[PDB]
Design goal:
3-stranded antiparallel sheet, 3 strands, Core gene UL27 family protein (chain B), viral protein/immune system, Core gene UL27 family protein, 2 chains, 51 residues, mainly beta, kshv, VIRAL PROTEIN-IMMUNE SYSTEM complex, part of a larger assembly
Amino acid sequence: AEPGRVEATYRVRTTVNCEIVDMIARSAEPYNYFVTSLGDTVEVSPFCYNE
Amino acid sequence: TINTTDISTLNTFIALNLSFIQNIDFKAIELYSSAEKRLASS
């Protein structure tokens, strides 16, 4: 909100945001871990709990 | 008198009849193209 009113110290306005994104991820041949297009890294197998 | 060409002439040659070999051009090959090389990187 940022009121910018006449205050001695500062404002306290705040906001939140739910962010839902779709992206592309790639994995190597062993398929034990993979990475996403966004750059986030993860050490789990993309194939899991599916036979 | 007749020409000697009309007389049949025999020949005695055990012809080798060899067979040389050359001119095998060598094409250059590459296992992977550049596209998958770029795709190889994450």
